[PDB]
Write a protein that binds this ligand. Structure first.
Ligand SMILES: [Mg+2]
Ligand SMILES: [Mg+2]
Ligand SMILES: [Mg+2]
Ligand SMILES: [Mg+2]
Ligand SMILES: [Mg+2]
Ligand SMILES: [Mg+2]
Ligand SMILES: [Mg+2]
Ligand SMILES: [Mg+2]
Ligand SMILES: [Mg+2]
Ligand SMILES: [Mg+2]
Ligand SMILES: [Mg+2]
Ligand SMILES: [Mg+2]
Ligand SMILES: [Mg+2]
Ligand SMILES: [Mg+2]
Ligand SMILES: [Mg+2]
Ligand SMILES: [Mg+2]
Ligand SMILES: [Mg+2]
Ligand SMILES: [Mg+2]
Ligand SMILES: [Mg+2]
Ligand SMILES: [Mg+2]
Ligand SMILES: [Mg+2]
Ligand SMILES: [Mg+2]
Ligand SMILES: [Mg+2]
Ligand SMILES: [Mg+2]
Ligand SMILES: [Mg+2]
Ligand SMILES: [Mg+2]
Ligand SMILES: [Mg+2]
Ligand SMILES: [Mg+2]
Ligand SMILES: [Mg+2]
Ligand SMILES: [Mg+2]
Ligand SMILES: [Mg+2]
Ligand SMILES: [Mg+2]
Ligand SMILES: [Mg+2]
Ligand SMILES: [Mg+2]
Ligand SMILES: [Mg+2]
Ligand SMILES: [Mg+2]
Ligand SMILES: [Mg+2]
Ligand SMILES: [Mg+2]
Ligand SMILES: [Mg+2]
Ligand SMILES: [Mg+2]
Ligand SMILES: [Mg+2]
Ligand SMILES: [Mg+2]
Ligand SMILES: [Mg+2]
Ligand SMILES: [Mg+2]
Ligand SMILES: [Mg+2]
Ligand SMILES: [Mg+2]
Ligand SMILES: [Mg+2]
Ligand SMILES: [Mg+2]
Ligand SMILES: [Mg+2]
Ligand SMILES: [Mg+2]
Ligand SMILES: [Mg+2]
Ligand SMILES: [Mg+2]
Ligand SMILES: [Mg+2]
Ligand SMILES: [Mg+2]
Ligand SMILES: [Mg+2]
Ligand SMILES: [Mg+2]
Ligand SMILES: [Mg+2]
Ligand SMILES: [Mg+2]
Ligand SMILES: [Mg+2]
Ligand SMILES: [Mg+2]
Ligand SMILES: [Mg+2]
Ligand SMILES: [Mg+2]
Ligand SMILES: [Mg+2]
Ligand SMILES: [Mg+2]
Ligand SMILES: [Mg+2]
Ligand SMILES: [Mg+2]
Ligand SMILES: [Mg+2]
Ligand SMILES: [Mg+2]
Ligand SMILES: [Mg+2]
Ligand SMILES: [Mg+2]
Ligand SMILES: [Mg+2]
Ligand SMILES: [Mg+2]
Ligand SMILES: [Mg+2]
Ligand SMILES: [Mg+2]
Ligand SMILES: [Mg+2]
Lengths: 114, 88, 275, 68, 100
RNA sequence: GUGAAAUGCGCAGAUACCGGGAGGAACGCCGAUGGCGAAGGCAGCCACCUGGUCCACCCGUGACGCUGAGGCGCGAAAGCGUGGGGAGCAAACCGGAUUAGAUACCCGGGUAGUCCACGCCCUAAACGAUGCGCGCUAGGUCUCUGGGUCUCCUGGGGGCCGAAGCUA
């Protein structure tokens, strides 16, 4: 159990998954739109991301979590909404950084991205 | 590359009077160096095709001068390609 | 290169020969050969125990140095590079400044006339030997000892090599020519570079008789025998296998793994071969 | 808010001048455009060619996290 | 014969004895390939833009030199050979190009 | 993952996250209505080798020029040969869907191939659908790169708009 830690917000088009981690980076609890209850495309919505970030903080707070830095990855829908959700949870939000991985022209993308 | 002096040494070696630059004889000689040094560059770098184009242009230029100079003075030509070792 | 032949006999059409380009001395160091007793595949009971061998050209064994730590620091000139009938790779004649002469597998790169040396403090150039621990990671390397002071055992065939992949404590990690990832001891010597004659794979024997020159007597199919003879033997006409395909001794021969389950060297093999 | 102005004499080919250069990267490290640097065409190229060289030596980043 | 700027980054956690030793191997090496040192700016430690060899700091060297053209490349390889040299960059030297 | 799904992956512990490692491919920002090349085409960074090209000086040669049937060379992609390499992608092919059906479009898989070396093939909306050179016939503005006395003028490129004029 720890006081402070991290929040990782995976924001795709089809979903938002959120995992809360320890100081060093190892997971305490996580959630996604599926976990909070939606299947299919509804998981991709900002509401879904909301519930999921909320349930995420809640679940973390039960192990003592109070302070969290927030890493946001992925140009998704429930991206920004998931952020609101985190602040309003009764968790500190010590900082907010976007760390979306992006190629310096790496691998060839699937056809769908060309 | 070609050293600036090496250019000169040839420039001088082939010049018609101690003022001479850019005469038939000199151009020919000068070219003959740019050719031969490239000919070699290509012997190694076989896949360098563009630079072959250059060589191809260079050779052609030299052929032109030779045809002219041969029209104007047989013995002067006969001598020049002798001195550069050429008609093969 | 590799040498082709105009197709003046039907065999000559395809047959290729080695180019022998890198070879510079055509007689072996008299003081370094010893005669090899041909076996014809038969053991001391007299019994054939490896099939279809015999009748190859005569050979002299060239004594090769697979140790090298033998003479640390004593440097040496590369006198000649010669053919060796007993290996795919070529051998290099070393004149040590000492005056001792020895033969090593010629690495690809070795130019006759150059100098080489073995020891922890050897320069990392082609032909030198050092403990693996003192070999820079990523460098490709041949003739590798598998345990210390025990003699080069790994990558000795024409064109083979290994790659150091990182160290871990006492051991270092190689990609053996086969792709396997194995931990070898750091104190094991290896020679920098890869084995020469790397074109050896592209030789086309061309005719039965060449296979014969090489000591390889004709090989007969299980399919072509009788049932007393082989799992695959018999059937009226041609036949498929009619069972899982097997060696003469009955064991399955497609896919069946065969390494000892509980071998101690298992502890040191990281990643079995690929492909 | 033109960067070219904000600095006096500066060599463009000084790939070590970590102090000057770093002013030309976004807060995420991306090399800045002329609409922000104020370079002309030619200048711009020399700058870019050397920033990169820096990043190779270890003095300038290739990328940096966006912070809010 | 031309003017170049050999940069080199070494292991940060070397004692001044080790560090010096590498500097010797280097300095011999330049001499061995027939470098002729002109300027020489040893700039020591410096925090890096990114962890090279998983290590935030870096010990910097810099040598302007006049060496033969052909040999320059081989030098660089030979420079990099050590488990301790962590970058080598060898640049053809040019006249500063200034703004303002 | 999609329009929504399903196939697929996942309690045999997947996703999401942290650290180490392996490997191959392409080089984000800069980047442009940009630059280079005869064309095909060429993009991280370094060095070596090497071609074309522009300017300025107006020093040399003295019509040595232009073109070019044949010849010769280069010639994207796909494809072939020999041998490497194979992460991502992906013909073929498997499966899920959509649909009346769906040998497609969408989704999950997937082998050549895509990458290297060497050798072939010699094609194209290989397009400016515009052959090369030279002379002459308003300007206006944008731009890249030289030279000047640096307002601006003078060369060489890349655009736009327009005199005259051509044009169905
Ligand atoms: Mg979804
Ligand atoms: Mg020309
Ligand atoms: Mg002629
Ligand atoms: Mg050969
Ligand atoms: Mg032949
Ligand atoms: Mg033949
Ligand atoms: Mg013949
Ligand atoms: Mg015949
Ligand atoms: Mg025949
Ligand atoms: Mg042979
Ligand atoms: Mg040979
Ligand atoms: Mg004999
Ligand atoms: Mg004897
Ligand atoms: Mg014997
Ligand atoms: Mg006996
Ligand atoms: Mg007996
Ligand atoms: Mg017998
Ligand atoms: Mg047998
Ligand atoms: Mg036998
Ligand atoms: Mg041999
Ligand atoms: Mg083969
Ligand atoms: Mg074969
Ligand atoms: Mg034999
Ligand atoms: Mg056989
Ligand atoms: Mg048979
Ligand atoms: Mg059969
Ligand atoms: Mg049969
Ligand atoms: Mg029979
Ligand atoms: Mg029986
Ligand atoms: Mg019997
Ligand atoms: Mg039987
Ligand atoms: Mg049978
Ligand atoms: Mg039968
Ligand atoms: Mg039969
Ligand atoms: Mg049968
Ligand atoms: Mg039958
Ligand atoms: Mg029958
Ligand atoms: Mg039969
Ligand atoms: Mg049967
Ligand atoms: Mg069968
Ligand atoms: Mg059967
Ligand atoms: Mg063992
Ligand atoms: Mg290194
Ligand atoms: Mg369980
Ligand atoms: Mg990871
Ligand atoms: Mg353009
Ligand atoms: Mg152009
Ligand atoms: Mg004049
Ligand atoms: Mg033609
Ligand atoms: Mg082609
Ligand atoms: Mg192709
Ligand atoms: Mg193909
Ligand atoms: Mg085919
Ligand atoms: Mg192929
Ligand atoms: Mg075939
Ligand atoms: Mg293949
Ligand atoms: Mg189907
Ligand atoms: Mg169906
Ligand atoms: Mg289908
Ligand atoms: Mg597909
Ligand atoms: Mg796929
Ligand atoms: Mg094939
Ligand atoms: Mg044609
Ligand atoms: Mg076009
Ligand atoms: Mg055009
Ligand atoms: Mg038409
Ligand atoms: Mg046409
Ligand atoms: Mg034409
Ligand atoms: Mg016309
Ligand atoms: Mg201008
Ligand atoms: Mg100007
Ligand atoms: Mg213009
Ligand atoms: Mg117009
Ligand atoms: Mg009009
Ligand atoms: Mg018309």
């Amino acid at each position: 159990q720890v006081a402070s830690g991290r929040a990782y917000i995976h924001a795709s088009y089809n979903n938002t998954i959120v995992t809360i981690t320890d100081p060093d980076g190892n997971p305490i609890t996580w959630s996604s739109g599926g976990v909070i209850g939606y299947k299919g495309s509804r998981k991709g919505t900002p509401y879904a991301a909301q519930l999921a970030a909320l349930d995420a903080a809640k679940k973390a707070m039960a192990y003592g979590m109070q302070s969290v830095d927030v890493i946001v990855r992925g140009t998704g829908a429930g991206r920004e909404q998931a952020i609101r959700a985190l602040q309003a949870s009764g968790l500190q939000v010590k900082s907010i950084v976007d760390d979306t991985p992006v190629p310096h022209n790496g691998c060839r993308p699937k056809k769908k991205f060309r | 590359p070609i050293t600036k002096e090496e250019k000169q040494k040839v420039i001088q070696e082939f010049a018609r009077f101690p003022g001479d630059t850019g005469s038939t004889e000199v151009q020919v000689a000068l070219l003959t160096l740019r050719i031969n040094r490239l000919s070699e560059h290509l012997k190694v770098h076989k896949k360098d095709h563009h630079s072959h184009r250059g060589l191809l242009m260079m050779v052609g230029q030299r052929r032109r001068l030779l045809r002219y100079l041969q029209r104007e003075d047989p013995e002067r030509y006969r001598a020049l390609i002798e001195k550069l070792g050429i008609r093969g | 290169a590799v040498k082709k032949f105009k197709p003046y006999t039907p065999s000559r059409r395809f047959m290729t020969v080695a180019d022998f380009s890198e070879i510079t001395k055509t007689e072996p160091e008299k003081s370094l050969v010893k005669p090899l007793k041909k076996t014809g595949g038969r053991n001391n009971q007299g019994r054939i125990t490896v099939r279809f061998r015999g009748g190859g050209h005569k050979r002299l064994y060239r004594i090769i140095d697979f140790k090298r730590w033998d003479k640390v620091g004593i440097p040496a000139k590369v006198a000649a590079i010669e053919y060796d009938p007993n290996r795919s790779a070529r051998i290099a004649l070393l004149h040590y400044v000492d005056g001792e002469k020895r033969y090593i597998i010629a690495p690809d790169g070795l130019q006759v006339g150059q100098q080489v040396v073995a020891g922890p403090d050897a320069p990392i150039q082609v032909g030198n030997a050092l403990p693996l621990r003192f070999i820079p990671v990523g460098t490709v390397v041949h003739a590798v000892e598998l345990e210390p002071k025990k003699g080069a055992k790994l990558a000795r065939a024409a064109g083979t090599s290994a790659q150091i992949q990182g160290r871990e404590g006492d051991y270092v990690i190689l990609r053996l020519p086969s792709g396997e990832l194995r931990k070898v001891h750091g104190e094991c010597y290896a020679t920098v570079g890869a084995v020469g004659n790397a074109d050896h794979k592209n030789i086309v024997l061309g005719k039965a008789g060449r296979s014969r020159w090489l000591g390889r007597r004709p090989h007969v199919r299980g399919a072509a025998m009788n049932p007393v003879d082989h799992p695959h033997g018999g059937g009226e006409g041609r036949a498929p296998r009619g069972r899982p395909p097997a060696s003469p001794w009955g064991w399955q021969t497609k896919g069946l793994k065969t390494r000892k389950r509980r071998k101690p060297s298992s502890r040191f093999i990281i990643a079995r071969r690929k492909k | 808010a033109k960067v070219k102005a904000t600095l006096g004499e500066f060599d463009l080919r000084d790939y070590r001048n970590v102090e000057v250069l770093k002013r030309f990267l976004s807060e995420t490290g991306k090399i800045l455009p002329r609409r922000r640097t104020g370079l002309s065409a030619k200048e711009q190229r020399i700058l870019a060619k050397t920033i990169k060289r820096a990043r190779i030596l270890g003095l300038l980043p290739f990328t940096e996290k966006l912070v809010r | 014969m031309r003017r170049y700027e050999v940069n080199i980054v070494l292991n940060p956690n070397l004692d001044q004895s080790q560090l010096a030793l590498e500097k010797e191997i280097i300095q011999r090496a330049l001499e061995n390939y027939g470098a002729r040192v002109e300027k020489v700016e040893e700039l020591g430690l410096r925090r890096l833009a990114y962890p090279i060899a998983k290590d935030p700091q870096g010990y910097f060297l810099w040598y302007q030199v006049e060496m033969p053209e052909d040999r320059v490349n081989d030098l660089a390889r030979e420079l990099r050979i050590r488990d301790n040299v962590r970058r080598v960059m060898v640049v053809k030297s040019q006249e500063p190009f200034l703004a303002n």
